[PDB]
């Protein structure tokens, strides 16, 4: 009987592929060939942040574009001031091997987790003035890879259990569970409207899920290796994914197929982080070659290179306003380029 | 803007306090030695953890040897896809890889060999030393002494293998048990010595689940590792 299901899945995949090919009347590269190239931009590090002991693994810019949060595997979550570089808070994490961090839009709460399979929340604006654990989400059966805040009460988290979870911080329970991924989920990305989110699960494929409906609304299978980075396009209709194959791939939610690919022959190492600028014209992807490549979102060419880090790049974040971009690496130093 | 300058001074004082905290902590961390305990499911790693300690995805065991703090981390309750999270333990002092030598037939020894090879060849682990604990030597001895579990039936090369000259057999141990032990050791030695030099080293130690001296061994190994990392400083 399993042969019937196998044949049904095969013919459904063939039909979906034929449909995607039928909608491929043109290609983004041939239409963008008329766009003026960005050329070259010599971005330099304007601020250097020092104080982290172990390799930094996660980072997330705040909506205020002033304070930033960085997590190191020494059990430390540091809040830095972008303008003055002064550390605001230094939360000691109960779990040393932290792998994710999220700065709430309002800045009242910050989430972080890791191999402990527990997502701890910390309130930065307690009446006492100190930072204390607010909630503990210990329902996951795997390491927390990435997390992002939808609001002051709802939070999406990705765990090594191959399933994402939307939690209500107030009750501390799984409000919704997203299942379907084959491998371990690595990164998360919240759309501008906070209604849909995408993520890769080490299966060379990404899945767009709806926060309210709680189901895999769409799926993409453009990549060829494990996906480690993902970020929504500023418009919310597309997103770029980075994989260990040393190539970034753009996918549109409406096209249901890959739009373009950014890669180069000399670039053979894996990818760790990817993000878009305010306008989305520049795609900044962090590579294991100790530098970050800024590609043109339309010309598919290397518009810039940030080779200021001496160790692997772990996280990369662009402010909502797009003034500067913070690139963290395993060297325990955060560099803000502008 | 006097208020702005006052806020800046307050933030500078807070940053100085945080720098002191990160300093009194740079001090506690570099003095502590982190270790990653790994091994097959059928291995006696649980017994070793129990002896050393006498829902969470990671368990921590803190123990002091010669006034030196060692934090051993077990990655239990985690999926068997280790290719991703293992990279998180690149800076650990050592990886205590416990393999059951008596678990050879499926053939779990082959799976342990493949896992050790993958760990030794992993890009981000090329600078991390691996302490190989060939655990459950009593079971291997009992099986090879009085038993029909012929090793050549699962390792044809064993038919041509002979005890080396540098072998230090235990007083009273049967020559066949020593031969099997040193063969299982060379099985990992061939893998560890072909893709490593001046980056990471393997420390094979014949141990048992109930042996306490294992702790000491780790300590010893740690010293070696550290010393060797110190020798690297003398290279301009």
């Amino acid at each position: 009987e399993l042969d019937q299901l196998r044949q049904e899945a095969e013919q459904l995949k063939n039909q979906i592929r034929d449909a995607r090919k039928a909608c491929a009347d043109a290609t983004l590269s041939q239409i963008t060939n008329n766009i003026d190239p960005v050329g070259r931009i010599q971005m330099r590090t304007r601020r250097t942040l020092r104080g982290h002991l172990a390799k930094i693994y996660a980072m997330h810019w705040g909506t205020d574009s002033r304070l930033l949060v960085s997590a190191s595997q020494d059990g430390k979550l540091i809040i830095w001031d972008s303008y003055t570089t002064n550390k605001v808070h230094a939360i000691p994490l109960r779990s040393s091997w932290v792998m994710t961090c999220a700065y709430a839009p309002s800045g009242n709460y910050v989430a972080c987790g890791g191999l402990d399979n527990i997502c701890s929340i910390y309130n930065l604006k307690t009446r006492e003035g100190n930072v204390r654990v607010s909630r503990e989400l210990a329902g996951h059966t795997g390491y927390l890879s990435c997390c992002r805040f939808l609001d002051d009460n709802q939070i999406v988290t990705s765990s090594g259990d191959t399933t994402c979870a939307l939690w209500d911080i107030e009750t501390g329970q799984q409000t919704t569970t997203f299942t379907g991924h084959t491998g371990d989920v690595m990164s998360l990305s919240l759309a501008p409207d906070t209604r849909l989110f995408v993520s890769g699960a080490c299966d060379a494929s990404a899945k767009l899920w709806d926060v309210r409906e709680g189901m895999c609304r769409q799926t993409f299978t453009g990549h060829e290796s494990d996906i480690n980075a993902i970020c929504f396009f500023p418009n919310g209709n597309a997103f770029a994914t980075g994989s260990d194959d040393a190539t970034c791939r753009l996918f549109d939610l409406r096209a249901d197929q890959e739009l373009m690919t950014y890669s180069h022959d000399n670039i053979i190492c894996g990818i760790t982080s990817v993000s878009f600028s305010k306008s989305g014209r520049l795609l900044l992807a962090g590579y294991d070659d100790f530098n970050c490549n800024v590609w043109d979102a339309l010309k598919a060419d290397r518009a810039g290179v940030l080779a200021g880090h001496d160790n692997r790049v772990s996280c990369l974040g662009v402010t909502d306003d797009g003034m500067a971009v913070a690139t963290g690496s395993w060297d325990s130093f955060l560099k803000i380029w502008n | 803007t006097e208020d702005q300058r006052n806020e800046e001074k307050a933030q500078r004082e807070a940053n100085k306090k945080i720098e002191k905290q990160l300093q009194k902590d740079k001090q506690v961390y570099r003095a502590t030695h982190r270790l990653l305990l790994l091994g097959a499911g059928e291995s006696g790693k649980n017994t070793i953890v129990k002896q050393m300690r006498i829902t969470s995805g990671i368990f921590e065991t803190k123990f002091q040897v010669d006034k030196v703090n060692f934090h051993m981390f077990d990655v239990g309750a985690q999926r068997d896809e280790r290719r991703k999270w293992i990279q998180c333990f690149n800076d650990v002092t050592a990886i205590i890889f416990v393999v059951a030598s008596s678990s050879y037939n499926t053939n779990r020894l082959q799976a342990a060999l493949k896992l050790f090879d993958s760990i030794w060849n992993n890009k981000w682990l090329r600078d991390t030393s691996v302490i190989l604990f060939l655990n459950k030597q009593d079971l291997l001895a009992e099986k090879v002494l009085a038993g029909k579990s012929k090793i050549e039936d699962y390792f044809p090369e064993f038919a041509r293998y002979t005890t080396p000259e540098d072998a230090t057999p235990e007083p009273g141990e049967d020559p066949r048990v020593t031969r099997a032990k040193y063969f299982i050791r060379d099985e990992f030695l061939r893998i560890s010595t072909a893709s490593g030099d001046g980056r990471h080293y393997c420390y094979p130690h014949f141990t048992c689940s109930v042996d306490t001296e294992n702790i000491r061994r780790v300590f010893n190994d740690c010293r070696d590792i550290i010393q060797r990392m110190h020798l690297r400083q003398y290279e301009l």
Partner: nanobody, 128 residues
Framework: QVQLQESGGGLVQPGGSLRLSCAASGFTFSNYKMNWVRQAPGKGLEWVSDISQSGASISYTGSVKGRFTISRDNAKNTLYLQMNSLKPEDTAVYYC?????????????????????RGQGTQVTVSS
């Protein structure tokens, strides 16, 4: 999407010979190391053999050395496993596994859980 289609397996008597063939698609077959593993009835995944990218480095398990031959052809993205002499204990479902990442030699495809880069496998049975 990554796709691996195994075929060539079937019934055989003791001492027979088979030639399993795995057709790959959805990636650069030459940039990844290939492996053959097997799962016996009522048993876990067992690694059989491995062949590197260029096809120079080859390895087999102790119970397979000098009995099976692994090979690859990057000109068509295909893998081959010639079984010269089989035995009853060889009955199993054979799977073809690919290296997790390219330009690497550390494999973690022996995972018991569902591996995202393995084919459906081919059932081979040997009986007198």
């Amino acid at each position: 999407q990554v796709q691996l289609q195994e075929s060539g397996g079937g019934l055989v008597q003791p001492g027979g010979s088979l030639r399993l063939s795995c057709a790959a698609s959805g990636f650069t077959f030459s940039n990844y190391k290939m492996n053959w593993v097997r799962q016996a009835p009522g048993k876990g995944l067992e690694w059989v053999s491995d062949i590197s990218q260029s096809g120079a480095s080859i390895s087999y398990t102790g119970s397979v050395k000098g009995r099976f031959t692994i090979s690859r052809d990057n000109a068509k993205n295909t893998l081959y496993l010639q079984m010269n002499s089989l035995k009853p204990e060889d009955t199993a479902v054979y799977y073809c596994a690919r290296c997790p990442a390219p330009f690497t030699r550390d494999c973690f495809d022996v995972t018991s859980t569902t591996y995202a880069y393995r084919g459906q496998g081919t059932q081979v049975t040997v009986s007198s």
